[PDB]
Amino acid sequence: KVEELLSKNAHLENEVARLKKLQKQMSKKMNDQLELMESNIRRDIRQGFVDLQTEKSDLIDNVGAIPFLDYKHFASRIFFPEAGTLTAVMIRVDEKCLAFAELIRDKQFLSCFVHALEEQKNFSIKDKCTVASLLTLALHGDLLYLTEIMEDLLQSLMDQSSNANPKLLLRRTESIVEKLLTNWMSICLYGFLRESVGQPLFLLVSALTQQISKGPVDSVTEKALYTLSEDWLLCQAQDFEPLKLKVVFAEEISESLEVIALTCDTIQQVKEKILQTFQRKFGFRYTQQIRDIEIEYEKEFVMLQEVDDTSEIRGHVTMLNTLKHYQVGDGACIKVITPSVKDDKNFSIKYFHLVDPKIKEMYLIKLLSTKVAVHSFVENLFKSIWGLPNNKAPLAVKYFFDFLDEQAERKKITDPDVLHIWKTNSLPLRFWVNILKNPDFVFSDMEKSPHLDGCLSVIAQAFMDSFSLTDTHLDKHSPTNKLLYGKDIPQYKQEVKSYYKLVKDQTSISSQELKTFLQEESKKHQNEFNESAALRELYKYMQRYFTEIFQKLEQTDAPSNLKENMHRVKELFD
Amino acid sequence: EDKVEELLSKNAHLENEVARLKKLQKQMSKKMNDQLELMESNIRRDIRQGFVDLQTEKSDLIDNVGAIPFLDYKHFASRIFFPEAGTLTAVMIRVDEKCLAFAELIRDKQFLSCFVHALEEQKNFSIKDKCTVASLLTLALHGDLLYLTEIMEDLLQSLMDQSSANPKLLLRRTESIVEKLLTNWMSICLYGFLRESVGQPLFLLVSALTQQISKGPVDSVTEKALYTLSEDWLLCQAQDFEPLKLKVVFAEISESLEVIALTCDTIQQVKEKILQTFQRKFGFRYTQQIRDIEIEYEKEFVMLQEVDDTSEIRGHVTMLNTLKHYQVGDGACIKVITPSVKDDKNFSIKYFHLVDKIKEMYLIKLLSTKVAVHSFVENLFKSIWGLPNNKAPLAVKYFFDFLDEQAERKKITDPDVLHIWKTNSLPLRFWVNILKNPDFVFSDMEKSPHLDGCLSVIAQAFMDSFSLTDTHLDKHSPTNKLLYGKDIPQYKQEVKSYYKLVKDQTSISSQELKTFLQEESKKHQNEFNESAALRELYKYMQRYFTEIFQKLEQTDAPSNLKENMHRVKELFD
């Protein structure tokens, strides 16, 4: 048994030797790894600083004519932004409808109708917005009458019970008159939108798209290097270098084009950068549908795809194919002719790009760096929103603001903060904010990404804060989203106070001019929507609360012919 | 056969080693993984903090002073004429026959002309000598600036038409006598405008740079700090600290005042900050001499100094007493009445403050500083190239019109050349020296080397404003150029305008010119003794006597003149 002792002893000696060596190896390895990470930290921090200090201004991308959506779809997204079971038919039988439409146009009927429906516990906000939008559809050919009824309704909404504090009015769209007012603002402001606000909004979108496209984007988390929102910022680092490709379009025709991509871009992302560079350099899409262009690399002429038979696999997730993967260098000929992975249901839990299983803050500069680069387009858009084209505000605004003036007067109020509260609560917060946050509603072929929605959310949060009436003091404890535009807000606050004041000072609106305009806008889209389906869906509510409506109608000394009309519509639809 | 014993014993020992080894290894592994974690967190906490600071900088640099403490013109000129040795300056600051002879001599245009030219035609004559005699001449003729202007101008006409190679390389640097002459002339003629428009914004910029650096930790040793404008002065290692709102009182009669110091300041630094916060607050200093104010702390009444019996010691170097060392809390009352270690020759090699690794981490601070002070800088600059009531200072309008005139006589149809001369003679000759040396202009101006580094950044930017080359900024640049880089192009435009606007201003009437120059002559007539100056100048005259006489003969000089020249050498000898 001394044999086993000699074997175990020799082994013990030898194992001590190994452990001793292993300790030293792992020590040196650790120290080296440390040096590496440190060097990378320095390099990336400095590179970030340098980027901030040296950002060229290349977001200058010409467009000319702007691809607005048809008014029907804009309105469709602004009236009903949830379901579209009726929108389709309302975009693209006469006796009962005529009866309901004749009925509706009677002021006291519509009044007692709305008032009755809003006098129900059984009546929710969704119903309210529904019937309000149906009303607008029904009376879009008669905006003047619509306006009048809305005014009477608003007067009621003030004088009635909201006297607890005049500042808590129109905070949010809950009543029928509120939804009504929103929709109204969309209608009467659509023109001014296309004239003044449309273009700079597009350019802000164009630019934002582009500036993010200068830096690496995880195709999975949808996170990137350039952003305005700290949540979308990339955690882990990324080693990469840009490529100046020479993409050509095609005994075949010639059409060269310099396109800038990266060594870490997925094929699809490169197709994006090329369609984008195209529409930004020329003003028109090469192909409207992104799923038509064949992309081909010339090795010595090989077609390239999202994934091929040579993709790395780690654990349970596959790595996408970048550009380094196909060994692509600087000045590589790329062909685009005329002949998806993301279409898969399970895409985010099967594919891998730039994150796997951590100094995020070293990229904070990028926020600033992005924020500066895009700032120009912002102040434009913003100053186009609260602007006075030829010292004149849009008629809708001037009228409605003068109305608020009148009503504040009629309530006997001596505190401008209130009028400011109404004014902000009825225009920038009901309408403009909803546009800045959703530009796809306005423009044709406007595919809007979640990240872009995040950044636009930051820009809009700052837009709202422009109208604040409270002196926010920025300190170490504040959202990063608020610390980006912080220094700029107190300016906007002053321009906003201005905008309101100058409007109040602008001359009154001639009733002849208001009527002319409103009837003009009625004419522009009279036959765009069918009153048919709207009145039809509206009567559903009418008969749902018929008894109540009738009772309220009695409560205000109504004529015979009117009640007879009501029962007549009921007896025609039934 | 007892081997079984040994093999066991040995194995025991061996196995034990293995055990320990593993444990050791294991523990060490953990340590590393923890170390990482810590540094990671620390890094974030600083990076973010820096970012946050850039986004939250309040404007508290608003510190009043009122009337500015200028230096007597005597010392200003003393430092702008001789910026090196002051063995002669002190004599001029605070024989009748011979001196009057020399003074009457110099006032002849032909003698002084031939003097200068001959002197400038000698290889034995160094630059330092040329500047020396130029300054001596200026001192000697300060009461007669009209004559001085005249001789200077004729000398310039000479230096210009004598070259006949490229007009863009005139007035580049100070090497001929005419050039140092030109500089000194500028100082005299513009000291007025200095006090007028450039005095205040410069002093306020110094006050501002002073305050902003005082906001963060400053290594008392390497003189490096957290808030700076040059990457070089930026701190390396992190420092851990919180601010302190001290209730400083002045003694028992009393007087209260809030001060903001740090939990990592040397006592001396705290003294600096109380004096500075005071003078920024009231407009005057409680004490001019900084070594008369006693600093006392109250714990139960206890005095505190630079080092005590309980100072930490590592390796072979001592650590200074911070405010944390004496356990000073937020709101600690500090007594100040009327009754250093930095004075020790071997100071920097014996002590320790904040160094004993990621520096780029603090690049934000440069910005954070650069932004914070920008206000003041744009003042100073836009004061320098500004036009008070649409009128450039007489001196400037005059000399610039002179340069136009001369350029026109050379048939030069190139605007770039006029621009080159104009920048080469005014902003680079005079203004830069003042940005980089505000202590020449101000009473009691302690200028730290760091402050000099920063001013060197700002001055480099200033200089870059007058440049005629479009600079494209890329990743390969200094940090100092990267800071103000996006600001330079606007300036270059303001400068081109300024030169155009000076030119388009109405000319200067000879009556107004003479009035001005004689007025400025009569102001400072008695501030310097012509005696010692002429005395030191005659040294130069007799050194190169024969050559002067030769240049004189070669220019049809009259008898009475040469007779005078020999007469003077007769008097001094």
Author numbering:
A (entry chain B): 531 to 622, 633 to 790, 795 to 844, 847 to 885, 896 to 913, 929 to 1145
B (entry chain A): 529 to 622, 633 to 702, 704 to 790, 796 to 844, 847 to 885, 896 to 912, 929 to 1145
What did the publication describing this PDB structure actually write?
Plexins are a large group of type I transmembrane proteins that serve as the major receptors for semaphorins. Semaphorin binding to the plexin extracellular region induces formation of the active dimer of the cytoplasmic region, which triggers its GAP activity to inactivate Rap through the non-canonical catalytic mechanism for signal transduction.
We therefore removed the linker and directly fused the coiled-coil with the juxtamembrane helix (the N-terminal helix in the juxtamembrane segment) of plexincyto. In the CC(a)PlexinC1cyto structure, the two plexin monomers in the asymmetric unit form a symmetric side-by-side dimer. The dimer interface is formed by the juxtamembrane helix and one side of the GAP domain, burying a total of ∼3200 Å2 surface area. The center of the dimer interface is a 4-helix bundle structure comprised of the C-terminal portion of the juxtamembrane helix (residues 567–584) and the N-terminal portion of helix 11 in the GAP domain (residues 929–943) from each monomer. The core of the 4-helix bundle is dominated by hydrophobic interactions, involving residues Ile571, Ile575, Phe579 and Leu582 from the juxtamembrane helix and Met933, Ile936 and Leu939 from helix 11. A loop-helix segment (residues 1038–1058) between helix 15 and 17 in the GAP domain of each monomer wraps around the C-terminal portion of the 4-helix bundle. In the active dimer structure, the last two turns in the juxtamembrane helix (residues 585–591, corresponding to residues 1282–1288 in mouse PlexinA3) convert to an extended loop. In contrast, the activation segment in the active dimer adopts an open conformation and shifts away from the GAP active site.
